Amino acid sequence: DPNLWTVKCKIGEERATAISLMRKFIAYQFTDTPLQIKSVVAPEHVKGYIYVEAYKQTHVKQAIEGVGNLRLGYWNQQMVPIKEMTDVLKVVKANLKPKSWVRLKRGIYKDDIAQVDYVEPSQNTISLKMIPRIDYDRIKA
Amino acid sequence: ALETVPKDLRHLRACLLCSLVKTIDQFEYDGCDNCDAYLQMKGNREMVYDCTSSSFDGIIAMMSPEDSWVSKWQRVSNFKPGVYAVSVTGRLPQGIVRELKSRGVAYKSRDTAIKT
Ligand SMILES: [Zn+2]
């Protein structure tokens, strides 16, 4: 079975790296220097490095040449045991369902629990249920 | 191919049968490639929102399903290369899942993630 290798990357750039690798593979698949990589895993929970699937280290080492994003993680290629080939894909509970409970960061109701009522298909705004905390304009000037 | 690769990161959805992740423009124009005759997705947006759901996490660069343990584990070996996911949360209504079994399409839950 193929092996899974690990490569460091910048913090906050994982989907961009994935799409760039996809574009590079698609553009250099019909040439004399194809890429032998099988796939790459970029879990959402992790942030700072990405995974890659290959047999040998030389494959990925020569497949990540020229890219300016993975330059940092180019002089070292760590190998993980075979037991870690299934925990990476695990996800602990996406996270968008009506009639659920969610919390807020901005606004005034910071660090408070609230409840979803309706979701707009436009993916621009979502309703929310919360009890008001204002003073009803009796204290403030 | 260049038609399955997502164009813009923003406004991206994913299917529930084969977990095909692409852009909304590609879904509206091209639609689901791995399952089109049995889904009838091209030529409309209501069906896109009815079946596909944006509640999904994880991205994998599938390129050789015939030879890949990830493909075997996810049961996506018989699909075309593309950008798939590992967990899509959702379930089709009780109006579209019925005909898949009648037409010989086994509806399986791709939400491999655990709950609590
Ligand atoms: Zn699908």
Side-chain angles (χ1 to χ4, degrees):
Chain A
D1 296 353
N3 185 13
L4 195 155
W5 305 87
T6 60
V7 296
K8 305 181 179 301
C9 176
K10 301 299 181 61
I11 301 173
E13 295 74 4
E14 55 286 1
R15 183 175 297 181
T17 307
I19 185 65
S20 55
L21 182 60
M22 284 294 294
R23 179 177 175 85
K24 180 177 182 179
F25 178 88
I26 296 170
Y28 296 93
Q29 58 187 356
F30 296 109
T31 177
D32 192 13
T33 58
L35 290 66
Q36 301 179 5
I37 301 172
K38 300 299 182 180
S39 176
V40 301
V41 189
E44 299 296 348
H45 64 268
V46 68
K47 190 182 290 299
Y49 68 87
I50 52 176
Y51 305 88
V52 61
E53 184 179 0
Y55 294 93
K56 298 181 179 180
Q57 61 85 8
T58 184
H59 298 171
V60 298
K61 182 179 180 180
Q62 300 180 0
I64 67 183
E65 63 82 18
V67 304
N69 181 19
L70 293 303
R71 58 183 297 273
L72 180 63
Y74 179 83
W75 303 92
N76 300 272
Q77 294 74 5
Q78 182 62 12
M79 180 276 293
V80 297
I82 306 300
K83 304 299 183 181
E84 301 185 0
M85 301 298 178
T86 180
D87 61 329
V88 66
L89 54 71
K90 302 297 295 184
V91 183
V92 68
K93 188 268 185 178
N95 301 89
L96 179 61
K97 192 74 182 179
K99 304 294 185 179
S100 55
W101 293 267
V102 298
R103 297 175 60 181
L104 293 175
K105 292 179 174 296
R106 313 296 183 173
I108 183 64
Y109 308 96
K110 301 182 180 180
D111 302 332
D112 301 331
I113 299 76
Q115 183 182 3
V116 183
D117 183 71
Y118 181 85
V119 67
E120 300 292 357
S122 64
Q123 300 174 217
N124 297 123
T125 180
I126 185 171
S127 58
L128 192 68
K129 308 181 183 184
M130 182 62 181
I131 302 178
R133 294 177 178 271
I134 59 176
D135 58 358
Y136 306 92
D137 182 72
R138 65 187 298 275
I139 304 305
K140 59 184 294 302
Chain B
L2 289 300
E3 185 174 11
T4 185
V5 66
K7 301 296 185 179
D8 188 73
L9 71 173
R10 192 186 180 178
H11 289 294
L12 76 177
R13 308 180 69 88
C15 305
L16 182 59
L17 300 177
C18 62
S19 61
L20 176 61
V21 184
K22 300 188 300 185
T23 306
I24 185 62
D25 61 359
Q26 290 186 349
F27 287 135
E28 182 176 355
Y29 180 85
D30 184 7
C32 177
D33 301 326
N34 301 334
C35 177
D36 193 2
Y38 301 88
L39 209 169
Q40 288 74 18
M41 184 177 183
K42 182 173 180 179
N44 55 333
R45 299 174 55 87
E46 284 69 356
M47 185 63 179
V48 179
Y49 290 98
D50 295 325
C51 74
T52 60
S53 180
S54 295
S55 181
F56 65 96
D57 291 333
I59 56 180
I60 54 180
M62 299 303 303
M63 301 176 290
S64 301
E66 70 291 352
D67 302 326
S68 48
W69 175 263
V70 302
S71 183
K72 176 54 175 61
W73 186 266
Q74 191 176 355
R75 305 180 180 180
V76 296
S77 298
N78 61 329
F79 302 150
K80 302 179 181 178
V83 182
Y84 301 157
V86 298
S87 179
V88 181
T89 55
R91 181 178 182 179
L92 301 180
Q94 299 293 355
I96 303 299
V97 64
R98 184 175 180 180
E99 58 79 21
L100 301 170
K101 184 177 181 61
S102 182
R103 298 183 62 180
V105 181
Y107 175 85
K108 298 182 179 180
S109 59
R110 297 292 182 176
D111 178 68
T112 306
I114 60 175
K115 301 297 182 299
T116 305

